Amino acid sequence: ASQAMQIQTYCNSVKQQVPVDFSQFPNLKDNQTQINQGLDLAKGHADLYLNTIQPQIITNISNISNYFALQNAIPAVLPPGSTKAQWLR
Amino acid sequence: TNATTITMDQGMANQASQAMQIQTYCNSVKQQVPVDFSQFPNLKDNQTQINQ
Amino acid sequence: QLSVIKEQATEYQRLSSDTRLVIVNLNNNLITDSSNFQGIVVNLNSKVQGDNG
Amino acid sequence: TAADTTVKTVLTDVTTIKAQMAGVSPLQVPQTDTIANFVARLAALEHH
Amino acid sequence: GYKGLQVQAQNAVTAATQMSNAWDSLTSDLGSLITDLDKGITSGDDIRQLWL
Numbered sequence: 001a002s003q004a005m006q007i008q009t010y011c012n013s014v015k016q017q018v019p020v021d022f023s024q025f026p027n028l029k030d031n032q033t034q035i036n037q038g039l040d041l042a043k044g045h046a047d048l049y050l051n052t053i054q055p056q057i058i059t060n061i062s063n064i065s066n067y068f069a070l071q072n073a074i075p076a077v078l079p080p081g082s083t084k085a086q087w088l089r
Numbered sequence: 090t091n092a093t094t095i096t097m098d099q100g101m102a103n104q105a106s107q108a109m110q111i112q113t114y115c116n117s118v119k120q121q122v123p124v125d126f127s128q129f130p131n132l133k134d135n136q137t138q139i140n141q
Numbered sequence: 142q143l144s145v146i147k148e149q150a151t152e153y154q155r156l157s158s159d160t161r162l163v164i165v166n167l168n169n170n171l172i173t174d175s176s177n178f179q180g181i182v183v184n185l186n187s188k189v190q191g192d193n194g
Numbered sequence: 195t196a197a198d199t200t201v202k203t204v205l206t207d208v209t210t211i212k213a214q215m216a217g218v219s220p221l222q223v224p225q226t227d228t229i230a231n232f233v234a235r236l237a238a239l240e241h242h
Numbered sequence: 243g244y245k246g247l248q249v250q251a252q253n254a255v256t257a258a259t260q261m262s263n264a265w266d267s268l269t270s271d272l273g274s275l276i277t278d279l280d281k282g283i284t285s286g287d288d289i290r291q292l293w294l
Contacts, residue, residue, distance in 0.1 A: 001219070008219035012106060054215070055092075055099040061211045062091040068205055074198035102218050109221040112263075116255055119172045122180040143294070147279035154272040161265040164258060171255045178248035179228070185244070186230040190237060230245070 004054055011046035014039070 001009075019036045022028040078087050123140045126132040227235075282293035 002217045003214040005217045005219035008106070009222060012110065012219065013222065015107075016110060050103050051099070055095050058099070058215050059092045059095045061208060061215060062095060065208045065212065066091070068201060068208065072201065072205065074195075074201055076195040076198055106218060106221070112259060113221060113223060113256075116168075116172070116259055119169075120175045120179060120252070120255070122176050122183060143279055143283050147276055147283065150272050150275050150279065154269055154276060157265055157269040157272060161262055161269060164262045164265060168255060168258045168262060171251055171258055175248055175251040175255060178244045178251060181244045182248060183229045186233060190233060193237075 004057075007049055007054070011050050014042045014046050 017039055019039060020032055022032040075087065078084065124136055126136040278293050282290045285293055
């Protein structure tokens with residue numbers, strides 16, 4: 001289970017919870033308020049990871065990876081056929 | 090643009106994972122059993138409403 | 142050649158859709174049997190709970 | 195030369211991040227109660 | 243005993259739902275193939291080759 005999968009599990013889990021009605025239990029009145037705000041807020045956070053953050057993170061590493069896959073080394077000596085001027089470039 | 094491919098990936102990945110969530114819940118809603126209040130005349134009408 | 146293939150594929154797409162339609166009846170049968178059994182269990186429990194009283 | 199070695203390291207760092215970011219976490223089926231079990235745990239607190 | 247048959251039957255349901263998913267995938271993918279052969283046949287040159 002990768003780090004992103006761990007976060008997905010959390011996001012998928014929270015998005016499925018159902019706000020409570022404790023209307024039958026005035027003793028729990030405030031507990032209903034606390035639960036339902038905390039949840040609503042985490043649903044927001046979850047969506048953000050799923051539709052914004054994780055895609056940004058993957059995107060960013062694709063571009064980084066793609067470059068250095070090709071520039072996978074540094075010429076420490078003047079390559080055959082180049083000038084000094086154009087090696088420094 | 091990688092962003093575009095990844096956007097497609099993530100879009101798809103999200104929709105399929107939710108689909109498995111809703112599909113499983115729908116299977117469970119269909120296996121749900123109806124009420125029976127035929128021992129309480131008082132309650133005939135709530136039975137037909139609940140079950141509908 | 143390509144038209145004969147596209148037609149064969151068209152027939153199999155129809156066969157696949159028919160198959161899936163047979164599988165809705167299957168799912169609905171299993172779902173019914175499951176619901177029935179749940180209800181069986183639920184009412185036996187009510188009987189046992191009353192008897193324990 | 196140190197640069198060339200650092201690029202090597204940079205690719206290391208990237209496959210690390212790539213390992214962090216792969217996979218599609220599968221469905222988790224919770225275990226909520228059925229009616230038989232809810233009536234019991236309740237019958238449990240009341241008769242003891 | 244009927245709690246046992248219910249669990250077996252629930253499993254069967256998941257199993258049958260996964261059969262539906264698979265067959266849907268086949269229907270749809272055959273769908274793509276039909277499109278592509280259709281477009282390939284009614285196209286030419288490089289565009290027929292793309293589709294095919």
